[PDB]
Tab-separated table of C-alpha atoms and ligand atoms in Angstrom:
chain	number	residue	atom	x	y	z
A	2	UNK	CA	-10.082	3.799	-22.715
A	3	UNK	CA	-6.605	4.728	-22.207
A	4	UNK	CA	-5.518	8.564	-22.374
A	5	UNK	CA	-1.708	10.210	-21.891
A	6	UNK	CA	-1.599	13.550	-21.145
A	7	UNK	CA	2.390	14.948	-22.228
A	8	UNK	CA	4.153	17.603	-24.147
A	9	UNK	CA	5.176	17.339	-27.598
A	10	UNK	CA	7.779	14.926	-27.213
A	11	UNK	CA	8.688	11.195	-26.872
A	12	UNK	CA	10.984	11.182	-23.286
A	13	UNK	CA	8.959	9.688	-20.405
A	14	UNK	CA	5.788	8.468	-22.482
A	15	UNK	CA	8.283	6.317	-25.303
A	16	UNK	CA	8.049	3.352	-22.977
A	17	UNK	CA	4.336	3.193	-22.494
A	18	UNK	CA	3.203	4.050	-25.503
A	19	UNK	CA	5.990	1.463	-27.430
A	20	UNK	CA	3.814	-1.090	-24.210
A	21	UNK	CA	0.490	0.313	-25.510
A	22	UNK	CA	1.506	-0.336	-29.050
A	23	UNK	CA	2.714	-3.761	-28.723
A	24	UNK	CA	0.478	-5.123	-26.460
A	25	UNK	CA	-1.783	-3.541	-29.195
A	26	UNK	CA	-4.117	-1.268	-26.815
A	27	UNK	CA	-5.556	1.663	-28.671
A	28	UNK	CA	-5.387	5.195	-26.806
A	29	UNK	CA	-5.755	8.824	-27.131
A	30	UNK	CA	-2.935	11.366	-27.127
A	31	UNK	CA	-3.586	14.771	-25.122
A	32	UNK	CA	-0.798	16.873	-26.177
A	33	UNK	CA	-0.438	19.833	-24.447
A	34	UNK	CA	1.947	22.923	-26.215
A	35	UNK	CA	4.408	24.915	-24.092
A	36	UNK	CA	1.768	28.085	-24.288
A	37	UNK	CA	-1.602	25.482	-22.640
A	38	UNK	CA	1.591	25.086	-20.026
A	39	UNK	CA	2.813	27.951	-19.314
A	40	UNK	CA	-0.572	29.117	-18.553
A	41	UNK	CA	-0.767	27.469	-15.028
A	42	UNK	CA	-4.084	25.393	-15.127
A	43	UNK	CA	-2.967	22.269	-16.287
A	44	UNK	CA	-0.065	22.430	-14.214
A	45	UNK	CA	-1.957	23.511	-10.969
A	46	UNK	CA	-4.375	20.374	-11.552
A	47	UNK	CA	-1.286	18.003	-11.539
A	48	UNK	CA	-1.156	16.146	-8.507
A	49	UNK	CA	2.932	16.500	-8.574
A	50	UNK	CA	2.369	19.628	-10.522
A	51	UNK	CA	3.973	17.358	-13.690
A	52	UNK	CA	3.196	15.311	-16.873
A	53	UNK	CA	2.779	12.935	-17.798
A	54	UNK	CA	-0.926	12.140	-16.941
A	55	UNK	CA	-2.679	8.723	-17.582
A	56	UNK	CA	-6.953	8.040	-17.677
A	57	UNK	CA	-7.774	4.638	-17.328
A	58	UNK	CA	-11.777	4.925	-17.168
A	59	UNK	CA	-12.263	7.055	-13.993
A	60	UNK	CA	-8.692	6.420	-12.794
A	61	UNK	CA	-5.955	9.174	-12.915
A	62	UNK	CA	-2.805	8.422	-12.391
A	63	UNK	CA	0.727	10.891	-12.395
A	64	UNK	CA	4.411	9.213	-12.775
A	65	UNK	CA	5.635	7.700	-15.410
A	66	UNK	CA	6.657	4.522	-13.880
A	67	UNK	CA	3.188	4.008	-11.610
A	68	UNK	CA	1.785	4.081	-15.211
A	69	UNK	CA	4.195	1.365	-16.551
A	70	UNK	CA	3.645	-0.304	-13.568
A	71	UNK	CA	-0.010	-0.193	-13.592
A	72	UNK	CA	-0.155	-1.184	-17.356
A	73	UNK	CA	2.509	-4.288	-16.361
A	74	UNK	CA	-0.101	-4.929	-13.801
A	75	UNK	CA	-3.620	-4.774	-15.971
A	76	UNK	CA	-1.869	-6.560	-18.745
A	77	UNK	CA	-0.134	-8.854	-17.256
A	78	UNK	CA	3.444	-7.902	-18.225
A	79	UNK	CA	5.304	-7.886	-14.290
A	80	UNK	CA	7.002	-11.593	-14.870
A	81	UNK	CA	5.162	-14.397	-13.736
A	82	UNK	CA	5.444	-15.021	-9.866
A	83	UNK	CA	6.582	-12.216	-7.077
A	84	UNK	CA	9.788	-13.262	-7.542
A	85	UNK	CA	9.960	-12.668	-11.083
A	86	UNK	CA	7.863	-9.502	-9.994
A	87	UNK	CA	11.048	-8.120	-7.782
A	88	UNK	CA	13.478	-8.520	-10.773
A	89	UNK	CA	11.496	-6.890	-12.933
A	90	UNK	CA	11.080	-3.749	-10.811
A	91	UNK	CA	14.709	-4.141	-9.864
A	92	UNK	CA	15.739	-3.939	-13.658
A	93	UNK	CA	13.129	-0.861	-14.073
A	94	UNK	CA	14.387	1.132	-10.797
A	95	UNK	CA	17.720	0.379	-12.762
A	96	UNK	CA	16.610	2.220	-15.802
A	97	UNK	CA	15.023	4.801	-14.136
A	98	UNK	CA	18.075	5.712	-11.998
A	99	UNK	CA	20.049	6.042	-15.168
A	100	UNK	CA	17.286	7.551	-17.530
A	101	UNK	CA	17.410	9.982	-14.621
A	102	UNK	CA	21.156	10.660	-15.313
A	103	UNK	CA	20.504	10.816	-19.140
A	104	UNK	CA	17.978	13.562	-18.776
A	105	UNK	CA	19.917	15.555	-16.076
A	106	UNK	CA	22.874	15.378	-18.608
A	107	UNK	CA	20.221	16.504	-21.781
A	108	UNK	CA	18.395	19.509	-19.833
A	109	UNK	CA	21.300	21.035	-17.180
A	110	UNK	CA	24.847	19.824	-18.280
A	111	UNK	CA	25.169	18.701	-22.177
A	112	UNK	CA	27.627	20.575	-23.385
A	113	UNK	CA	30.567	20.553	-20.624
A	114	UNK	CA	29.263	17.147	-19.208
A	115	UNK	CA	28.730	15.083	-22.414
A	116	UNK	CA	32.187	14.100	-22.430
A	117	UNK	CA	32.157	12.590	-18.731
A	118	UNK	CA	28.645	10.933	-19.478
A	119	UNK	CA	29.598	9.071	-22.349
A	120	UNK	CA	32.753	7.828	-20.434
A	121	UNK	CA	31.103	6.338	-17.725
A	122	UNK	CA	28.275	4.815	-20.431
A	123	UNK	CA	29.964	1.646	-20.686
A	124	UNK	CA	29.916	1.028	-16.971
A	125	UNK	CA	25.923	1.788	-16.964
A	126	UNK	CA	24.927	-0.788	-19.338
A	127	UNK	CA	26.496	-3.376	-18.647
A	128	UNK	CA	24.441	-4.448	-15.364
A	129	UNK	CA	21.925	-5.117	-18.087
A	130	UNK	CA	24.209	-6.902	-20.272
A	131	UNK	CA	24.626	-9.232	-16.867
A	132	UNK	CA	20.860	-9.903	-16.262
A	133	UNK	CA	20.246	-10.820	-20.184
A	134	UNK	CA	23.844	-13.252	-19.630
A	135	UNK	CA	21.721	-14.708	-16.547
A	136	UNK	CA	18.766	-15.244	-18.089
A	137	UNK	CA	18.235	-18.063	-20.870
A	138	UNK	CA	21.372	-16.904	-22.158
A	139	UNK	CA	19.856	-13.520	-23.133
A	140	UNK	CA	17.912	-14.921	-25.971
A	141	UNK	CA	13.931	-14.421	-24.329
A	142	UNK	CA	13.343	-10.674	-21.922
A	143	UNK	CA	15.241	-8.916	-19.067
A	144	UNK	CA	12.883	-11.223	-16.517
A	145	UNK	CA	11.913	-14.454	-17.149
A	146	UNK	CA	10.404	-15.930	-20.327
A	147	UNK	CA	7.513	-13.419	-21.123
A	148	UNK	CA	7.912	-9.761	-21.897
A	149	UNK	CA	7.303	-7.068	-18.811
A	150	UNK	CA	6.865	-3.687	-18.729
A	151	UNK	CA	10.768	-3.501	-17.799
A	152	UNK	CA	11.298	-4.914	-21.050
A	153	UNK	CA	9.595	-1.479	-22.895
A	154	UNK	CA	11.642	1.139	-20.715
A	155	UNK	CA	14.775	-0.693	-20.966
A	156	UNK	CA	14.413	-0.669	-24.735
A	157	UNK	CA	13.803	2.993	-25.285
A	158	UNK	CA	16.837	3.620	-22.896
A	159	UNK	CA	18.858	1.838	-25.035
A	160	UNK	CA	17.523	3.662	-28.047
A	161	UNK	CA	17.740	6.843	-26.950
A	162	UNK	CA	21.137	6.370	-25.546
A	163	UNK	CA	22.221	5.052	-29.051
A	164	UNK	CA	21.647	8.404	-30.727
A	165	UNK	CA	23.028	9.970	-27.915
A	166	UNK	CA	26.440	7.401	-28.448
A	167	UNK	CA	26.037	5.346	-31.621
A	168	UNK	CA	27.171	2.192	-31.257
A	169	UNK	CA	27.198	2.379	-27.578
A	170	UNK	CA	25.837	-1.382	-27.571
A	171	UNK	CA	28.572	-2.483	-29.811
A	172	UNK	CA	30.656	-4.261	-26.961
A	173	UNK	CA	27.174	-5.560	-25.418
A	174	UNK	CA	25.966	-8.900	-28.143
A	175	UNK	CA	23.173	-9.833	-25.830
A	176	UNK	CA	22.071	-6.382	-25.282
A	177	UNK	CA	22.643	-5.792	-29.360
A	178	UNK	CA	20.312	-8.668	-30.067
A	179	UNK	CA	17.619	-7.812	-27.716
A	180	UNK	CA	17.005	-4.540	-29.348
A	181	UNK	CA	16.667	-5.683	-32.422
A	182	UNK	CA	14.675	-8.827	-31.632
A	183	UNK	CA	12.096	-6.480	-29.757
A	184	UNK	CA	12.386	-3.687	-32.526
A	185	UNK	CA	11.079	-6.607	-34.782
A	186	UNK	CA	7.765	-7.106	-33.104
A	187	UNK	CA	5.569	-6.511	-35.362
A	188	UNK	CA	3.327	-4.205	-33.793
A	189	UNK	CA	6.102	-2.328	-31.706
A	190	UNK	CA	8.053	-2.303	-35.611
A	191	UNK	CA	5.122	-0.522	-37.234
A	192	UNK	CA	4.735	2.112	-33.930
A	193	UNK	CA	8.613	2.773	-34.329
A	194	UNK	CA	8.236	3.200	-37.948
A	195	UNK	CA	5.235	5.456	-38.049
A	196	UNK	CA	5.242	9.093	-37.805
A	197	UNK	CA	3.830	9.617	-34.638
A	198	UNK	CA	6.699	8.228	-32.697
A	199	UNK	CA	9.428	9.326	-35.199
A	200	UNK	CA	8.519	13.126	-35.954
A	201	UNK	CA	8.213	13.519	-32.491
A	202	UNK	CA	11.545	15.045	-30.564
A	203	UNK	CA	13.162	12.538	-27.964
A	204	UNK	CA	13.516	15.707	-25.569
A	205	UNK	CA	12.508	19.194	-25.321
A	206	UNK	CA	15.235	21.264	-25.349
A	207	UNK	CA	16.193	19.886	-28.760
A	208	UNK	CA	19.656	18.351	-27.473
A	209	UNK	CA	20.553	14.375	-27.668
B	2	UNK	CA	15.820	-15.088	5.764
B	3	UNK	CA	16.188	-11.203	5.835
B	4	UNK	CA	19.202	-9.878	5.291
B	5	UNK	CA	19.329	-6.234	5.055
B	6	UNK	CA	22.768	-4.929	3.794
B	7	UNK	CA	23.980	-1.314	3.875
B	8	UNK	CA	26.085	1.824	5.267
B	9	UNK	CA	26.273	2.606	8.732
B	10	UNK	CA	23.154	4.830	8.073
B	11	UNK	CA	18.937	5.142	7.888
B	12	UNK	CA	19.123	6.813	4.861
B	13	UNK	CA	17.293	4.790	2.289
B	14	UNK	CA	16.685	1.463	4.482
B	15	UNK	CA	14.972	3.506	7.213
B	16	UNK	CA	11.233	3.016	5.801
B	17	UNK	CA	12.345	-1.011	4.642
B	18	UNK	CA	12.895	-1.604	8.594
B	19	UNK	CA	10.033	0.670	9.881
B	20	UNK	CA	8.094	-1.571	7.903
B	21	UNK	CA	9.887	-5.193	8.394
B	22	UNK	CA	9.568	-3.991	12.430
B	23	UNK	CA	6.030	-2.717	12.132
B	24	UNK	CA	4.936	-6.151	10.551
B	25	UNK	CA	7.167	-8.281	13.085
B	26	UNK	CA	9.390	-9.268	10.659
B	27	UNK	CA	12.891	-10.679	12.001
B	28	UNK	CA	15.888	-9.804	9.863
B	29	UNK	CA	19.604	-9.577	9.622
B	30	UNK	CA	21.490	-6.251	9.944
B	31	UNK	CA	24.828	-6.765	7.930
B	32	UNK	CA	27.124	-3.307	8.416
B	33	UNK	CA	29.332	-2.230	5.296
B	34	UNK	CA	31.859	0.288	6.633
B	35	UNK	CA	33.497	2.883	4.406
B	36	UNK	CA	36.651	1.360	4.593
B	37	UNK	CA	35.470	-1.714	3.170
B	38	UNK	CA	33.287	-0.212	0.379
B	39	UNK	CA	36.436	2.209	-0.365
B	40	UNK	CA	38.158	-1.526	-0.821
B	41	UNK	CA	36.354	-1.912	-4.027
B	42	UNK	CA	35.268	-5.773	-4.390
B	43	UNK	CA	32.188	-5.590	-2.812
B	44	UNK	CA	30.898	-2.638	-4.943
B	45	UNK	CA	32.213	-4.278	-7.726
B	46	UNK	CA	30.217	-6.873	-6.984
B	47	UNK	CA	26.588	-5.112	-6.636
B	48	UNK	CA	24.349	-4.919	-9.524
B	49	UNK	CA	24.330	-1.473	-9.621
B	50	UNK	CA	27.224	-0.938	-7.687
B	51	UNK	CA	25.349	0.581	-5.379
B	52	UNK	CA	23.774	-0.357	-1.942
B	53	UNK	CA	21.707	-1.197	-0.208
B	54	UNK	CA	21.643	-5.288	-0.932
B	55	UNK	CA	18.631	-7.216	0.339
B	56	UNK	CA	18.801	-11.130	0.745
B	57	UNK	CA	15.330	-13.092	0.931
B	58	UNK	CA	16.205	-16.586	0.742
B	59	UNK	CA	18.550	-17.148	-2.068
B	60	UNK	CA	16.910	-13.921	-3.674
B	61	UNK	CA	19.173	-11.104	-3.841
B	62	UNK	CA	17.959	-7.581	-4.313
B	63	UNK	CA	19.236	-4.411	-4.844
B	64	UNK	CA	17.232	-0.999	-5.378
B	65	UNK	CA	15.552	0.432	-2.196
B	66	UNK	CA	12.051	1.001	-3.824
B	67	UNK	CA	12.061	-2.575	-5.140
B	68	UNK	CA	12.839	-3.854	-1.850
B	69	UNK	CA	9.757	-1.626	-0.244
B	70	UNK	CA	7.800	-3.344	-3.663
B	71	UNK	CA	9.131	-6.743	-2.487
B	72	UNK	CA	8.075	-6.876	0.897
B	73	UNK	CA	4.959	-4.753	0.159
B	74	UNK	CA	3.780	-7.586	-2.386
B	75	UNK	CA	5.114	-10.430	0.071
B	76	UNK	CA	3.424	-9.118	3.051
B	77	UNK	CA	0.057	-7.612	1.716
B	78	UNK	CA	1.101	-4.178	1.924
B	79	UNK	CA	0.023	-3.217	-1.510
B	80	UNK	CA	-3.518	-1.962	-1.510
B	81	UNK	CA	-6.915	-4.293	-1.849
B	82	UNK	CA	-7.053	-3.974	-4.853
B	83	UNK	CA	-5.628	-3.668	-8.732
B	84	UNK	CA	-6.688	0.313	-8.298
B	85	UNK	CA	-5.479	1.199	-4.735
B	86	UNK	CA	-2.095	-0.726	-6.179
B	87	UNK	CA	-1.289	1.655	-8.739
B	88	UNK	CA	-2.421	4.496	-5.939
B	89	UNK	CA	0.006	3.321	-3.198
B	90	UNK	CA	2.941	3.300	-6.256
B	91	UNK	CA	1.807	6.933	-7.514
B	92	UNK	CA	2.101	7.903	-3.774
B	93	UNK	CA	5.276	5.896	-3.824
B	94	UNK	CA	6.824	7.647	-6.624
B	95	UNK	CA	6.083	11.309	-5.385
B	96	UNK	CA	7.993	9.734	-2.103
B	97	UNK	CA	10.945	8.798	-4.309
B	98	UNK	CA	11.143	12.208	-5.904
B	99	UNK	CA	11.273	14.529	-3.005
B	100	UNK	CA	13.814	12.102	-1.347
B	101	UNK	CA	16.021	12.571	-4.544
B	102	UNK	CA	15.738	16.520	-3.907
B	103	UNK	CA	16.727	15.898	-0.313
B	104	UNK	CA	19.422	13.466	-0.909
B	105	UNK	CA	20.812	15.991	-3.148
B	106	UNK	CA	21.012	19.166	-0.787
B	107	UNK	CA	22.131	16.951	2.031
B	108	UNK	CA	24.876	15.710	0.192
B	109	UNK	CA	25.791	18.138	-2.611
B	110	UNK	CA	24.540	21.875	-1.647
B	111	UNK	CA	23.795	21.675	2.401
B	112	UNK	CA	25.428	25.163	3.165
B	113	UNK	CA	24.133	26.783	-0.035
B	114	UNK	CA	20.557	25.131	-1.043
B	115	UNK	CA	18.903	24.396	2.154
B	116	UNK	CA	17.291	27.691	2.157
B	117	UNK	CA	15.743	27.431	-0.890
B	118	UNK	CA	14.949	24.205	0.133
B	119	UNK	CA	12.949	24.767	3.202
B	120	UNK	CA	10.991	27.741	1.308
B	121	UNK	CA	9.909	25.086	-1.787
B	122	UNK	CA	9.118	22.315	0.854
B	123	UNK	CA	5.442	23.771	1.862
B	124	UNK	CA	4.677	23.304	-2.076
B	125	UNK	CA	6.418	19.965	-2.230
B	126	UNK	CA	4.517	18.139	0.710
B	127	UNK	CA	1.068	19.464	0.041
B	128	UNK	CA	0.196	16.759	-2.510
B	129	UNK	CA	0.427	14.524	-0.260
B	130	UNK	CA	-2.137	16.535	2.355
B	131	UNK	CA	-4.059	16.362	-0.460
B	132	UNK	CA	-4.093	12.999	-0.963
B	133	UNK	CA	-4.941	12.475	2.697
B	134	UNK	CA	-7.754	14.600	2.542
B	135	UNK	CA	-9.092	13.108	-0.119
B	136	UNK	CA	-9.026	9.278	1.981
B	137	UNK	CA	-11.228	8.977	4.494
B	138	UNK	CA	-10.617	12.091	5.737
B	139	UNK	CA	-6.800	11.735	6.247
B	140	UNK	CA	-7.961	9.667	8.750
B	141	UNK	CA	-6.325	6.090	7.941
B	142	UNK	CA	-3.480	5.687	5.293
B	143	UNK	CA	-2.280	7.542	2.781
B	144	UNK	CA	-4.062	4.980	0.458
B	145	UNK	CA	-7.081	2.593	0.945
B	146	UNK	CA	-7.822	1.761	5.089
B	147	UNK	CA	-5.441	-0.313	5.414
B	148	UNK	CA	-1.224	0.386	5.638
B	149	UNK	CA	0.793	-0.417	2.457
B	150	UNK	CA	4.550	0.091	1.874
B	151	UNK	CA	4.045	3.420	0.588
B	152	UNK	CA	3.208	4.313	4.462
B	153	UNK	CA	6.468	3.906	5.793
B	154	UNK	CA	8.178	5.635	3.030
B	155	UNK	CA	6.338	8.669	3.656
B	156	UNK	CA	6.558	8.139	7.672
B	157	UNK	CA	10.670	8.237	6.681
B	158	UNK	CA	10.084	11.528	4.296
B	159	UNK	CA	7.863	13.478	6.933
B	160	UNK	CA	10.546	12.466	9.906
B	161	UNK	CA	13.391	13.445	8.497
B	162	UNK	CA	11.763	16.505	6.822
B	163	UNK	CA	10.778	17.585	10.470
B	164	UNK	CA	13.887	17.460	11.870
B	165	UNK	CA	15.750	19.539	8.504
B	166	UNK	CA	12.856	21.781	8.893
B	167	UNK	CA	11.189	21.722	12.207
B	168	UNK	CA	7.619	22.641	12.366
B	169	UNK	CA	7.418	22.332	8.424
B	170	UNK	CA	4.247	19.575	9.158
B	171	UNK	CA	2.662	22.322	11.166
B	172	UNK	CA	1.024	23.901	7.444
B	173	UNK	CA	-0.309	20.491	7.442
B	174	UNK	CA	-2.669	19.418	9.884
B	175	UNK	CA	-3.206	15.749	8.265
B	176	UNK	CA	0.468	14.809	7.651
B	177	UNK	CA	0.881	15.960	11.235
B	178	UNK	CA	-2.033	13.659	12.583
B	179	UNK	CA	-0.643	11.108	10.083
B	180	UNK	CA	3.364	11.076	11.450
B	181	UNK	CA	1.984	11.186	15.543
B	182	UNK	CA	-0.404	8.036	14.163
B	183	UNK	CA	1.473	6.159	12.404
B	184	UNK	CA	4.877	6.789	14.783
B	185	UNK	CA	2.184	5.552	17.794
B	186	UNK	CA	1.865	2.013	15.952
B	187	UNK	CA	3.205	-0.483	19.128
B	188	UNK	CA	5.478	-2.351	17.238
B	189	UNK	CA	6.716	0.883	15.258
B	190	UNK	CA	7.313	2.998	18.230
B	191	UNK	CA	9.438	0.522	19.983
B	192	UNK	CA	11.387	0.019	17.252
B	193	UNK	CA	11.784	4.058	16.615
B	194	UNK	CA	13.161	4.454	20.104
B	195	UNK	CA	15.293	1.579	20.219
B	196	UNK	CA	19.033	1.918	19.814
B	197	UNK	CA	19.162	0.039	16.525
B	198	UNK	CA	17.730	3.229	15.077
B	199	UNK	CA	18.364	5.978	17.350
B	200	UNK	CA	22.314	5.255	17.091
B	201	UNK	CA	22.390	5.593	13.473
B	202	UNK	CA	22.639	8.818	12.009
B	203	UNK	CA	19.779	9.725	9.183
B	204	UNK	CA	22.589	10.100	6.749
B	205	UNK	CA	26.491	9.308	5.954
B	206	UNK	CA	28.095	12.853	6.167
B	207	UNK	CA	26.563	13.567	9.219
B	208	UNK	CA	24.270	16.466	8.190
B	209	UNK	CA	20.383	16.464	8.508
C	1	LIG	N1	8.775	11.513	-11.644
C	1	LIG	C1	8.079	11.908	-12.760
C	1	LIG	C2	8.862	13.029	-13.491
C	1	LIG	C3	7.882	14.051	-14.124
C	1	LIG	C4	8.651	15.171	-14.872
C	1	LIG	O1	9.868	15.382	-14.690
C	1	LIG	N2	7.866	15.861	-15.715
C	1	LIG	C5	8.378	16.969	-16.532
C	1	LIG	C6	8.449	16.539	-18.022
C	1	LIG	S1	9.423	15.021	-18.287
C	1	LIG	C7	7.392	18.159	-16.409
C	1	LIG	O2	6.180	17.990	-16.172
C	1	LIG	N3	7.923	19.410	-16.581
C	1	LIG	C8	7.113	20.651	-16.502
C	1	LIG	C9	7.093	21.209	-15.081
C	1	LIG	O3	7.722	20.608	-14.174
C	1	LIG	O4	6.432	22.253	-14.915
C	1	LIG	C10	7.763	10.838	-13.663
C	1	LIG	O5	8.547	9.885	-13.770
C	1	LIG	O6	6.641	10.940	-14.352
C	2	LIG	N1	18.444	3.941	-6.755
C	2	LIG	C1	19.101	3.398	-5.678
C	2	LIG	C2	20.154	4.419	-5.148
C	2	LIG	C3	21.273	3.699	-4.325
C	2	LIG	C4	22.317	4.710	-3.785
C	2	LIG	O1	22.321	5.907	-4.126
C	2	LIG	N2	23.194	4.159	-2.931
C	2	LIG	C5	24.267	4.956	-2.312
C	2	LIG	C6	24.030	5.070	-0.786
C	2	LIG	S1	22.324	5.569	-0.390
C	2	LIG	C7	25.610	4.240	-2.550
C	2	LIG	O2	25.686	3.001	-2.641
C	2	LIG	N3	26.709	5.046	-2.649
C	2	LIG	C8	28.083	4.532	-2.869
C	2	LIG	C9	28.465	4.630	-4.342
C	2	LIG	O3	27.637	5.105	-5.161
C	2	LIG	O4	29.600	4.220	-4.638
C	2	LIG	C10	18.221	2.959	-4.623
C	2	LIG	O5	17.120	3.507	-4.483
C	2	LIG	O6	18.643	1.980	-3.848
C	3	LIG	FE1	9.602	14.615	-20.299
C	4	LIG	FE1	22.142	6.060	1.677
């Protein structure tokens, strides 16, 4: 029942699809090419005249994070009380704000601002090393004892910012072992593994 | 049990106390000045490093939008249901982007982007006239009939929109109805035109 609507490339549809996957939800993949694009009727239909686009049976919904948060909702991956529900967006508004710098650096400023980026890396991840160090000593999710939605987009931020700085997460244990305890999910292992997530470009303008 | 901490500014905790003063809420307003954020502890200090804080009860926040989520899920300002939820968050979102856009030409490109700007606005507000057509009308709140958190983040968008661009609402007959509405609310238009708002300036660098 579930349908994402995106270009030809992992970036804003990685963490709900790795959610999808692991939470073992099937769904359809709309992928729409830079010519179905360029030709101004998808676009014009898009409420924020952007992708992605979800379908949830009669419900269409724009913005990548209303979909992780609706998903966190349905499923029941948004912590288990309001106040768990507050940490977990506070941890996703986190990774948005910096996914947000990663992709400014990626599409407008790689090459002269790569240097700067990587710099200040260390200083960006370590908020989440803090929450993990706060939280059952690091060894469960970013919130609470159950994974969240947060828990998916923090992940592929990680990855993607691993490729983009390998061994970025070297001075971060807790941080270190949460990727590759939730890489190890079985069902989020296999999605990783399989060719539709790794043939598939993290970006579009083939820069990471 | 509110504590609201931040600049000497409305910037991104105007719509928080529209909507804590709207719902009779009592809070505390606790002032960082320059100097002292300059001073480095506090900063160094914030999650993010960034402000503004939020205190509810021994729960501290940070990240405006999860504050707006907070009090929104606290105070049943979050739709009626499971569908209008992810709605009011899509709405939300939209909010969130077009205040990045103006954060960014108020504070990096004033003298050089705000003509641009003001000619992309028209295209940049119309989703949401569209989305209050498409609700009773445009005759209630942006989502569902009843106000949710996403409200007074728009209110904040459209007001300080109108006075960067006055008359821009006047393309939009709904959002207009919607800001004189909404801005009539008792509680809401006392608080507008008391000092505690009107003496603070919409932003830090005193442009608008
Ligand atoms: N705030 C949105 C960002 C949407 C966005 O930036 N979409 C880009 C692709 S990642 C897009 O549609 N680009 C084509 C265009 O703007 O015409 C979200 O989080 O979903
Ligand atoms: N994503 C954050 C952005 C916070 C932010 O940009 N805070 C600014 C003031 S509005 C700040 O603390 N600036 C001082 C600094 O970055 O050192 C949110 O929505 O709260
Ligand atoms: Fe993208
Ligand atoms: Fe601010």
């Amino acid at each position: 029942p579930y349908t994402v609507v995106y270009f030809p490339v992992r970036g804003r549809c990685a963490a709900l699809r790795m959610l999808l996957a692991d939470q073992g939800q099937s769904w359809k993949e709309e992928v729409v090419t830079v010519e179905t694009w360029q030709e101004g009727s998808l676009k014009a239909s898009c409420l924020y005249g952007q992708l992605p686009k979800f379908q949830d049976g009669d419900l269409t919904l724009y913005q990548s994070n209303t979909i992780l948060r609706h998903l966190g909702r349905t499923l029941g991956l948004y912590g288990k009380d309001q106040q768990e529900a507050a940490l977990v967006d506070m941890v996703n508004d986190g990774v948005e704000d910096l996914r947000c710098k990663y992709i400014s650096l990626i599409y407008t400023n790689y090459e002269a601002g790569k240097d700067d980026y990587v710099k200040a890396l260390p200083g960006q991840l370590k908020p989440f090393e803090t929450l993990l160090s706060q939280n059952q000593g690091g060894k469960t999710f970013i919130v609470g004892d159950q994974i969240s939605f947060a828990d998916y987009n923090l992940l592929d931020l990680l990855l993607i910012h691993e490729v983009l700085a390998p061994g970025c997460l070297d001075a971060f244990p807790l941080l270190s072992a949460y990727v590759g305890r939730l890489s190890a999910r079985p069902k989020l292992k296999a999605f990783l593994a399989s060719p539709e997530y790794v043939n598939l470009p993290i970006n579009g303008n083939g820069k990471q």
